Structure 1
Amino acid sequence: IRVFAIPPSFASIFLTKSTKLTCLVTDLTTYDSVTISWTRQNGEAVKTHTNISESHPNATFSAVGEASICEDDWNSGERFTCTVTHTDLPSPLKQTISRPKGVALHRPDVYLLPPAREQLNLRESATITCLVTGFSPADVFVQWMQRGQPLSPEKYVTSAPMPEPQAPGRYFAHSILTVSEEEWNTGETYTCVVAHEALPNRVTERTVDKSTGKPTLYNVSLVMSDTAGTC
């Protein structure tokens, strides 16, 4: 028996425009007696959940949570709870979830660091890292997009915000994407896109590829003409 309550990240609030609260119960016996309504600070609740599975890959029970909370309720920070109805529990278990209170609001700075020359010499795979430094609150959501449209999440693996060493109230994440060296050597543009509740349009993106990222040579060609020109 395992029960986890997960708050809604800002990414879910932004992209899906809906704040969904998930209290999932997995790896336990099946009884099909699940009916959970997310209770507000007072006794009332908003709605019930949906799509509970009576089977699991390890032949157990798997439950999910579902809610639709108005966003100003999340902004104000009223405490929320999930209580279980499943008959396996002799006593219902309550999981408490809520938004942390009035923090600051700094904005991220995104830096793309290309693979090191030593790693590129091995001709195995190159790792490109996206550093998000400086933000505040602790939520950030980074996506990777190889030359055009999105890379699928097996590939990269961003970490979790962890307080920056020497800047009291800002944080930093780190997302690493592993690619084939040819792919990096052909010359593909890889883009890191960050969604944060502090950026201009909540999102930004920085792209780097073969020749922009720490190139060995600069190849320019200034061709100024008509230096006179009746101005």
Structure 2
Amino acid sequence: GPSVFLFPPKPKDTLMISRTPEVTCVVVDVSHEDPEVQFKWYVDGVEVHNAKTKPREEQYNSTFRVVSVLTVLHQDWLNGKEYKCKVSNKALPAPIEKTISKTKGQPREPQVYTLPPSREEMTKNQVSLTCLVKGFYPSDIAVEWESSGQPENNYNTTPPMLDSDGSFFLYSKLTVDKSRWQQGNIFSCSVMHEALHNHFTQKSLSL
């Protein structure tokens, strides 16, 4: 039979009133022998009906795929409400069911530290600048880099990972050409997360 996938809102959508956070329920591998798919949404037990269900799109398997999308309220998601996608189809013996939410626990405030490049990286052409983010819970974050109010292109950010305390941490490595660091250009690590004041902090690094 068919398979269901329940996708959450990207982190930054739930921290800015500017954005629109949503949950996407996706049914894949729907057949022509009955491609009637029915969506029932529930938040925290009680069913909602404010979901927008796109029409079936057949794929190149020769299989149908249906996407229902439910907008959330930022406070709802951050107050840890559970969202149930329920999928009905006359093939399936029993309706498939999915619950989703942010990961249960107590919010823990991240601590950001910026580390200048190691002295030995001076002998190369492009030095690495480091942003360490520690002690945050849950793990959905957002990290990136700006220099003079404008984003920096060349940085990779490692995923979050469970520390010994049960909270998370990460690093992001921004690679700049040796000159821009030498001159004293100020660089800037910004992070977004529920347990920050106004969901935003930023620390800067410069020679």
TM-score, length of structure 2 as denominator length: 0.72
Letter in 2 for 1:95: K
Contact 1:46–1:69 (CA under 8 A) maintained in structure 2: no
**1:185–1:170 Cα change, 3 Å:** same
Contact 1:35–1:48 (CA under 8 A) maintained in structure 2: no
Equivalent position to 1:188, from 182, 185, 188: 185
Letter in 1 for 2:145: W
Per-residue Cα deviation, 1:99-158 (whole angstroms, up to 9, x for no partner) = 334x333322111112223233121x3222210112233332112113321235xx3232
Other-structure match for 1:79: 82
**1:25–1:190 Cα change, 3 Å:** farther
Per-residue Cα deviation, 1:135-188 (whole angstroms, up to 9, x for no partner) = 233332112113321235xx32322332323xx243212122223334434443
Other-structure match for 1:99: 102
Identity value in percent = 33
Contact 1:104–1:136 (CA under 8 A) maintained in structure 2: yes
Q: Give 1:19 deviation, angstroms.
A: 3.4
Measured in 2, the distance between the counterparts of 1:108 and 1:175 equals 14
Other-structure match for 1:21: 23
Other-structure match for 2:160: 161
Specify every segment of 5 or more residues in structure 2 that has no aligned partner in the other structure, as ranges.
none
Between Structure 1 and Structure 2, how many residues are aligned?
Answer: 201
Q: Which has the higher contact order (CA 8 A, sep 6+)?
A: 2
Structure whose alpha-carbon radius of gyration is higher: 1
Letter in 2 for 1:171: F
Measured in 2, the distance between the counterparts of 1:29 and 1:109 equals 46
TM-score, length of structure 1 as denominator length: 0.66
Q: Which has the higher strand share?
A: 2
Larger deviation, residues 6-15 vs 129-138: 6-15
Measured in 2, the distance between the counterparts of 1:2 and 1:145 equals 41
**Structural mapping, 1:110-125, within 5 Å:** 110-123=112-125, 125=126
Q: Given the alignment of the two structures, is residue 67 of structure 1 paired with residue 70 of structure 2, yes or no?
A: yes
Instruction: Report the 3-state secondary structure (helix = DSSP H, G, I; strand = E; otherwise coil) of the residue aligned with 2:15.
Output: helix
What is the RMSD of the two structures over their aligned residues, measured on CA atoms?
A: 3.6
Q: Given the alignment of the two structures, is residue 6 of structure 1 paired with residue 3 of structure 2, yes or no?
A: no
Other-structure match for 1:140: 141
**Structural mapping, 1:200-215, within 5 Å:** 200-209=197-206, 211=207
Instruction: Report the 3-state secondary structure (helix = DSSP H, G, I; strand = E; otherwise coil) of the residue aligned with 1:139.
Output: coil
